[model samples]
Target chain A: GGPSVFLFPPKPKDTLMISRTPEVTCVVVDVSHEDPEVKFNWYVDGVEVHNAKTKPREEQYNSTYRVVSVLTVLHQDWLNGKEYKCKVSNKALPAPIEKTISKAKGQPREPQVYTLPPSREEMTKNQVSLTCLVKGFYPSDIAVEWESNGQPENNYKTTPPVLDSDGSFFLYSKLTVDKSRWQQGNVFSCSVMHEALHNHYTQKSLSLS
Target chain B: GGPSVFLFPPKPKDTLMISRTPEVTCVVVDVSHEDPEVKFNWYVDGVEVHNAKTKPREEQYNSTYRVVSVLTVLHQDWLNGKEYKCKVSNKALPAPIEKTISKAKGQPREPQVYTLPPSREEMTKNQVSLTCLVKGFYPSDIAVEWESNGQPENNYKTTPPVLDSDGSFFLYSKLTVDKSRWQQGNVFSCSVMHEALHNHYTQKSLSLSP
Candidate 1:
């Protein structure tokens, strides 16, 4: 085994803000082949931050030992929009590992839905498929479900949400049904649930005569 | 993330020997918080084993880095019962981590099977259960399966094999069936497959009527 290092709250794209005052902590962990002596350093925008206390702990799993180091920062310093960094150095590496801290934005956005109707060929082959594409959502937490004749359908698959350039996400949910059921005028619907929407769920329905 | 250390062929309880002369290698890997500077040392019993070459390599995953160190030993010295050790020290800890090499006897023994029949109460409640316990096997790689009336049954659970004090292993496979099917006079058999057994599988069968 060799040495490995990591930092928590990995650097994010946007600056995080703090409306209230408290303490914020960042952790740095080092895993190596065996007992490793490690050193920690803290910096802010190229200036070395002094007097910051770091707590280091040790843990063992199987045959390896892990050392975790935590650094606490003042909320006032965090809200100042300065880049905070934790640097780790150990005997196992030729260089040091550095991680930075970024800020978080408060709220997420609601998602938009687009539906694709089944094709004529699909209906003729006794197989009907419909797709719901959801996009422009934040925080990546959303649910999509299919209903046949107002009853929840479980025989469907959804793609893992993908991230967009604007930090939003998009995904697709595909539902498959028998063409016989489709020709019977059964109503198929796609419903979306997300935290950004309050109490009410968004839905779209389709039917073939 | 933090650093981790591991040794290959972990230290054995008994002394190991080599019958011939060649080179033997023991590897010690130390992974610590990313980008660690590491040092290596080798020892024999309590004395320092010098002039030995150690190869260290570094790799990165995500944002963290890992380092592996390998130590080579002469087979002649190993066969002489000399203890070999690798010690690793990184800046992440206060002290060095040490790992030693041990020997193996290289052969494993076959396992024995013991079956527990279903109870009368179980049969009356429409729930029939049977257990097959396999013990005293080495190398820990073995397969246990259940068959109903000579047909393979898939509705069963088997425990991960456990290591015994003597370096052997033991495990249990339990099969549950509907009591109605059991009362139909179906033969339930437990078959074991292992490397120690040559070609043929060891099996035990039970029937409710018998």
Candidate 2:
């Protein structure tokens, strides 16, 4: 007899806060309703910004996050504190209802630094392997890199952090390089990059009789 | 809540059913809930019939009736039968629901045909007033036509129907033809054509033998 409202899955009571990083940010919402026609709109800082009538997904700056008839919003600007709003509506309903989400303190995450394992300490051949590890993260945003003689020669394999029960993450990465580039008495460095969290980097010189 | 049925411009119980005739028929339904993106199927006598859906109106047909949406069903072969069905459903609905309406029987009202008027008997050199009268009908469907001998001519006028308190109809038409080519003794006639009511042709011989 009257208009009905149906929300897919459900909305979270507490705000799902995601610390903004310089790299990318992703969030997903499910809006499965009986009506085939659904529209989605997004807002920032109390200003109406994005409106999607047919497609359920919305992207900011670029298509970093995709919302499938579900609501998804991506942020490109990390310098300003912003709020995001996702609204869903259909023809059967009188007016569209919206949910506003606020993103506060857009600071970058810290980097994860890699350390050269001691097993490859014997200075003989021209090859060496360096491993980096980072713990306590849900969605990883850290990058590990290897440098030789103060120049960015090669990059190490990236490993994402796995979520743990204590709201932390564990991750590991490795880089294999030709030790001849930084022969005996030559300097090499390993660096972990992230915004906000403490940035880490390590420099070591190859040496042996 | 359960699904509710809504009809547009709900029809009154008794209105003399003046629309349904042997030439045209009108049917109405609530297609607002239907998906505008899909095509609907129409059936008559448990048989599939191809029909085109028109905006503001639609035209369909079976072997007998020419189905006009919100109009009349022409060619009433199933006029006396109660087996015709119109189903309006598409793939968009979770399930298709069909509504049934029967074609009721009543007094047949046919179309009225017109021909050249009489009174050409005293054709002179000037002009003569000719009048064509067609009577006996509830609703109006009459037209007056004039011709030169056998060719088509145009000087004719029609009068609107006057309804008595009892709700019957009386319609007539009168025309004046020029007698510039009148040969004192020429043959001219008038035919009364009541399309559905009673198709009859009445004529008179024109001769100035005095």
Candidate 3:
């Protein structure tokens, strides 16, 4: 069977038009098939961009293969009304898969950060689940991190950022720490890093004293 | 045009057989259409598990709609050889989409952890990046966490668990801290929690001094 390919930041007719700062735009193409060998090419307004900076990841499940190629572009070119495209070809397909981008108008929004503590029942069970909810951000790419006493903490579960109805994004990161730590008055913090807020971090902190 | 529905934990031939402890098995049905209105029913071994526990999430992209219904099951039912199925009915489709699960044999494995540090250039840029790679775990459900100075650290990015060629799973979580911390001799630790290793935590700690 021939490979199936999908492009994200999708447009109605497969042509994405955006109006925004365009600081960072990612054009991704995912191809699925039974073969692992695949090649990808990147283009901006028909000008070929080197594939050296792109990251192509291949994953296998139940004998089938899926390859994802990502191309990161600076929004400056996008603000200048530059178009972006990705072309993918593989042995299983007779033709290459291609997608393109165009310019449009848009605004940027920063995210709101909130920290929720563990419920009484959760604490009683010797588990303290802390949730950091980041909401209402545009561009869909934001970084969230947990910290304890100004240090980074890693035992947590985070959902992939979800798009909102208003064109922004929302996500939650849950940290399940031992109750002993909470009882010991350990301070937990949630910090958000985003392009909208340059040179500063959006942060929230909570403690179970 | 009508909607298209797909079921995961997919039954290749409309059936899935497994032999192992089923701590948690999720039966998910996804419906794609232009309308957001869709309903689902979940059955385990022919018994209704109630739709209340099912949360159907709706997403729209480029004027198209997609709804996903998830039903979580305890492994105890699988060990009892119970069947699981999901039925989705949407107006966009002519008929309902249904999928089922059956049985097979399986074993479990523990994960091994490794810590990788930032490149010389990253360090020179006053950035400290550390990655904890967890590999060779079975059953796919595992937790990996990071801590600094014996406390939980929260500024990290973790990849969704990926399946391996040998039926195991692998994943990595990356933590990026200020170089000042690394230079100050702060201790960074990666901790993993899984059913296979009950009560005990599998942890590895690294420092710039090492």
Best by TM-score: 3
**Each prediction's fraction of true contacts recovered:** 0.00, 0.00, 0.00
lDDT of 2 by residue, B1-210 (tens): 122222121121112233523311223333333333333445555665555343343323321212133222323333443344545444554566455444443453543222222332234325553433333353443334445466654544434554423343334343445564444555444443333433222332232233
Q: How much lDDT does candidate 2 score?
A: 0.40
After superposition, the stretches of candidate 1 with alpha carbons farther than 4 Å from their true spots are A1-54, A57-66, A69-209, B1-105, B119-126
Please give the distance, in angstroms, between residue B10's alpha carbon in candidate 1 and its true position after superposition.
23
Name the TM-score of candidate 2: 0.28
DockQ for each numbered candidate: 0.01, 0.00, 0.03
Worst 10 residues of 1 chain B by lDDT: B11-20
Instruction: Judging by DockQ against the true structure, name the best candidate.
Output: 3
Tell me the lDDT of model 1 at B42.
73
Q: Which candidate do you rate higher for DockQ, 2 or 3?
A: 3
Question: Residue B196: error of model 3 in Å?
Answer: 2.8
Q: Which stretches of candidate 3 lie over 4 Å from their true place?
A: A1-209, B6-38, B51-72, B75-83, B90-92, B100-105, B117-122, B160-167
Per-residue alpha-carbon lDDT of candidate 3 for residues A1-209, written as tens digits (9 for 90 to 100): 46666655432111222342222234322345445577778787898888434445555554555666655555456434577777877766778778776544446577766666654433465555676666667666567789897778887766677665456666667676888898888899988776455443577887775
CAPRI level of candidate 2: incorrect
Name the DockQ score for candidate 3: 0.03
Query: How much of the true contact map at the interface does candidate 2 reproduce, as a fraction?
Result: 0.00
lDDT (tens digit, per residue) of candidate 3 on B95-172: 777777654335657776666554443566555567666666766656777997678898776666666545776666
The docking category that best describes candidate 3 is incorrect
Q: What is the lDDT of candidate 1?
A: 0.61
